[PDB]
Symmetry: C2
Amino acid sequence: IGKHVKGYHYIIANLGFTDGDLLKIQFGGAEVSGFQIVDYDDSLVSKFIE
Amino acid sequence: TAINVGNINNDKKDETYRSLFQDLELKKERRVILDCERDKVNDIVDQVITIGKHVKGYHYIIANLGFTDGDLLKIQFGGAEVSGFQIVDYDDSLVSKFIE
């Protein structure tokens, strides 16, 4: 429908922000916020991901 | 406002396309002609959706003899009007016998 351009603002209320496929509304223009509990920045996680 | 869209590679495709429409944003362009082969139509149209240039306001013209031959349902409900050309008429009774 096209409601994701500059103007809209969405919140994903779950602990898996990077889990969902987000690139689809990455370039749309709207801002998107969310939450993450599995931080891919902590060094222990990188050892697990590898 | 004629832009040569032909000479582009496949690994720097998403970068040049957004830069093209941010060049078509200088004029505040709402009316575009595409004039491309059907394979390149959907690659443009796909990027058109991801940057968000298909809402109420825009209007495009697909300059090729196959308007229904490519996928159109994706930009169907965005709001923008889309024009094009069709030579293979699917209402003729000679084609319907060929299609069945």
